[model samples]
Target: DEAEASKFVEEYDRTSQVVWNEYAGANWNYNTNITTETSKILLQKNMQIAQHTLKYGTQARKFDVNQLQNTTIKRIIKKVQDLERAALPAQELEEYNKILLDMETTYSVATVCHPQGSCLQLEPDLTNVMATSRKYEDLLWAWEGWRDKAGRAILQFYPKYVELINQAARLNGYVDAGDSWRSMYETPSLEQDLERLFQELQPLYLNLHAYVRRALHRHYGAQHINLEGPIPAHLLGNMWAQTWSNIYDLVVPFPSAPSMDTTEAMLKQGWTPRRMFKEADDFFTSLGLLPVPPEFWQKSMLEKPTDGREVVCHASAWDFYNGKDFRIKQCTTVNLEDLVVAHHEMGHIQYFMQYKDLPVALREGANPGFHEAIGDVLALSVSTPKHLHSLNLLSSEGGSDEHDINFLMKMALDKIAFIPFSYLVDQWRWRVFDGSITKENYNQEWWSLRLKYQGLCPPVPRTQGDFDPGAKFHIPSSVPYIRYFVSFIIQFQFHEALCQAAGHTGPLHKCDIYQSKEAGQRLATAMKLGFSRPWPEAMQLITGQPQMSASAMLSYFKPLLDWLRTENELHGEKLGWP
Candidate 1:
């Protein structure tokens, strides 16, 4: 037993260090050789750990806290125990690795060719089309093209993929893949907790959805917009309508209003990717976080590559070698959206720097949602009118009713509209994984949930032949979607709490904690806790509350909700789905 425990820690310590190096190299240059090599190494190491856990975990658990005081040993103990509880056969473990690698390989090389007659290849081109193109026809074509091209690949492979993963889950003592995912929560009942949270938030989301649908009716005729039913997905000014912020200009009450144009402002000042990141760095450093390392600047994928290789355009922050090397991978343009995203990405960097010295296992956020929320929480503050004006990005001095409505609309479209869709992504996946919705009903079930939660209908009728769920990167990528849903909720909570720490007494929506040393101290304290403490303990360090609540978000958007309700009533718009 002693030898087993010794072997477990020894193996875990060596595997983690090597895996870190492999992952760093793969992220640095996403070539076939690097990606496959990394996956292979990870697969073997993970299998080893999985096997070791089943062998030694029961004996190791008898060791007292004092006996396992070594940080790495302590970290490995919990993980080994979890894996031991969910132990599977060797064949299933091998299948899990094969499936994981296959998915990774598919995502790595996936690309959509341009629909229009150009030699150009479309990599995230649908996103650009959704943003700038005004014509519904153009958006419709773009959406279809993306689904037909990139979406087709996932559909072809996903059945087998789902089968294998679900098999892996059942073999590992989980009821299903969804149950396996829900098990990650330390809470008493993850389903009940989420259900309660969703119930509280649904009214606000429904109000926002009704307001947006009415706005679309006014923009496009009733023929295109369903007044009392789910709105056409293509009309929302986004490829997926997951975030409707891109359509804010069309839907906002004041079309001529003078709100901050962050993209134009940045471009006018000739801000480069480096300059934008520098601005983000200054914000964090001011908050008592360490400055971004010089190596980050040298090595980050700041701009898109000129070479013809297909690089995934999704913006992401990476911590290679833990705290010592942090980088952002993005096809950054000199635009406001990218600027906000840069701040969010840097939030991850600052967090990595804060807890790098902790145990490898403890160096992450209390949960994936917490990590995602950190940068976004800061972005909420950074995007505030006060912060923008302070940076001279906005010529205007203070907020107005019109400005407030405009800001609220943008936030609602992006954040509020996202809640149901995010929740539904995993909801549908969970159903699919649990065998409650089989491959026969996958498309029907997908649309049914979208309509139920998102109040969205397909622009064109879809059948089992189409895998619209795969159209989203998260689906094929197999990243959990609930984290995004949870992140959207808690960032507001974090922002509100930080604003309170900064001694701001104004409306929740308008509060900004930028450059506030007090607020920064609160955040830094929590960031340092990382996963060393339970999520509630870490959350309590900053928010003064132990549980994730939508109350802050509700309060922040209350004024906007009231405005939207009044606007809808004046137009004789129905506020709920018929």
Candidate 2:
């Protein structure tokens, strides 16, 4: 049996590392380079990797490992040898990556050019203006400009992208591309899980939506926002209306209460990008996790380089598959937001470290949502005022009810407010992939779901050509979005469990698991499981609750819930939107 297991690896798993390394290395190079040449080389590298995977997939059927005595080896072999992408014919496979490349390129280098010719990238330019500017028209200009320049430019490629991916998935025996995406989670109940969880959280989402709409209404007047309908997308202080926390200036319930100005704190403390990242590194290490390797500091792009050579500023963490090289690519600034984001991005590296010794195929999160949840799970504790105070970044623990509500409201503005958008994003795509919503109704169905879920609508006219859904990064880039919806709910589930392990007793939001080795042991225990077990079994080990539920999130935000109901009624505000 040992010989059989050994032979399987020598025969099929031998070149897997080579394949993974080549593809990953090419991806790393392309993302860092932003060059036309790198794109073509990256595509070629992927094509070669596909060829190798397909061969393994074919040989896997000839020499089956299904009944192998070693269950771990069996699973690893099955995962490595079988790939959904291997089902595609060579031509379609090439086309798939090509289409994917074009879309990603447009997203990477595309810029919004004003009529007079001032151009701005999405990163610090449009992202900042959209986050802070209160002028409705300026927000409108930037929002539309981004969609027109970036989203519309890639609209021509989407139909083919959908068609080819669906064709490949259907041949692979899935119902469609959306179903294929869901299958990767290894959770059979994912769609229903999202549907049921969204419904569970619906009341809470509606409460927050009503409160924020009222705040915007008060600021912009009835002439701008209808009290009885969805809020304008542009005025929500986010380009997508997905997060309104930045509009705290407008929506703070207790305006006089002190709120976190982490940006100011970073400035006053004279924090460089290195110090900010060093602090994040410190938090993860405090839990007794592994420290970043010397290579990490040497290779990671922690800040925007002044060399003027283009690099993608979209944050990502990389595992080179060589077992010793892990890095994060972040365009960091001296702000608390970026500091928190640094924690999230570094989370991927920490996770990679936890499971790096697993058989190559098992070196991944148990499910996609698990990976997305990892960073937020860490950030939840890091963002706590108690943790911030410990770091000498804040003056108080934000302990009073007024401070608590203000904090919760700000948190909800991003965290709670994001749920509907998270749930609805892929819901639309699932329909699109299934042919329930025709291409003719693509943009129409997008806003319809936006209204149904988030009670949001466009600030200006949105024709189908405008391709509003494409405005979001995930769409053209063809990333599966349900993971984010799953991540948002389960993150609090993780936070609560970790805190309990840390011996904390308080309301869920108030508990911070900063340096509890027991908490670290619990977390590392889960991370080390990786994809070696089914997600529910793994979830059981981590949280003692096998199902992914939103109850933890509800408890965490309970005070906000009580306040919203009371505040809405007292203000004569309507509860549900039309």
Candidate 3:
């Protein structure tokens, strides 16, 4: 037992020092090498150590019943296999497809959930209780093993796999289901989305109020815009959606509708998680950050920002948070218009503040959902009309109170509608990957899913499907980016936690929401302690509860249905689903 614990401690400590020493270098060449050789090696080893720690400690033996029942996994794997063999006939035998399906139907509980038989020293009180135990040890082992193998596979078989992955490309099919959607302006129309948003916020950038004014004035200059009328009420709130995305050149994966007539329509299309991440490498280069290899972000150093005063954001956060010399790619078309600028970037800054003090190795959020929720929480706070009034951004001519509520209702409708299908994207990837389906007749499948969830029809192919530049890049990046959906769920948990903490849990638009300062403060306090605490415990400590729950999200969305009926006077809008 001592040997295992000591091994984990020593491995963690040594890797930590090496990772820091390597990245804290003076030259790109050296830093790049560290990122490639030293950093990656440390991550793989650390992951192995983590797996082994749980394996030996818990004596875990198989997949948890919950994960085994995760229909999302099998569904995505099947979908991906179909794509992999896009042109295949129904009679064709696909090895990968068969293997994955066999895995699903015949999987051993012990083999999939745990290789160790013991429960790794859980709380004694958990014994004999239903649902008190878990089977994720197998999940961890498999994930870590899969990651290591994938990394090694890339290094060893780059040429073969590249050809294989690109085969669908020649069939006039998209590289992967969601390979094309990540760029801000890859398509002429999408570029216009960026440009239109850019134009809307140009005036607000150099002339906004409070934190935004200060944040921008420190860099761009103050005498930038001369407006005769009140700035649009939502300008500050929407600015960072443009500016900071460019500053970090954060590559967001987007999907192309078969014949996308509009930018908003395209986002509603879903893709595999792996496809969404493939674009980050090119994106970082465009932003001037170190060009780590394609899969490097998956292994990037997730460190905390700290000197005891604050927490840093996860990997790549150092570039801009705290205004550290980092710049994401400047939009060629959109310049991170108005409200989106300060709010979105502030989301990033807030993340850094929360976890900057954590150990470099453990200095990241538990998942993508965690990061998204952190920013969204802050952005949503700033989006509140009461917060806007405090900053004097309210319309001076009309009643600010009336309009603020109206504005939020419109925005909330859009966000609420977007969630179910985005979650479907996660569901789709696992199915494709498991071999339940393949590329033949794929468009029909996608269209059917879209109609069911988004209430829209697939656009006829406007551009090349295989080379659809608007495809979500995560699919090619080679892993499940399910965190977004999970985080989408988790964010409401945090929002509710904050609401309960602040005692402001009523009609969101009508309620008085404060700045993200306390939320920021509490997060920083929690993350500073690092991954020493398990995710559930860590979450419980912060929210004063046991892990994130979906009730808050349900509560958050309940108003939208009410809004549709009451505000818009849409009669009979409440379907009988509930």
Q: What is the C-alpha lDDT of each candidate?
A: 0.75, 0.83, 0.34
**For model 1, which pairs clash?**
none
> In lDDT terms, which candidate is top?
2
**Residue lDDT tens for model 3, 1-578:** 33433344345444544533433332222222322354344434434333433332232122232343334332222222222333432322133223222222121111112355532211111111111112223323332332232222232222222344334333324544334222111233432432343333222221221222233333333453112211111122211111122211111111121111212221343322222222222222222222333333443332211232111111223322121222221111111122332333334434544454443344455434455555555445554555444434443323343343345333443344334445445445434433343444233454444444333322123222321101222333333454455555566666666666556755543443353344544555554544434456557756887644555655664544443345223322222110
Displacement of the residue 489 alpha carbon in candidate 2, Å: 0.8
User: After TM-score superposition, what is the CA distance of residue 37 in candidate 3 from its true location, in Å?
Assistant: 18
The stretch of ten residues in a row with the least summed lDDT in candidate 3 is 248-257
Error of 1 at 499 (Å): 0.7
List candidate 3 stretches off by more than 4 Å.
1-8, 16-361, 390-392, 396-405, 461-470, 503-506, 511-518, 557-559, 566-578
Model 2 residue 8 CA deviation (Å) reads: 2.2
Give the candidates in order of lDDT, highest first: 2, 1, 3
- For each candidate, give its TM-score against the true structure: 0.89, 0.96, 0.46
Candidate 2 local lDDT, residue 38: 87
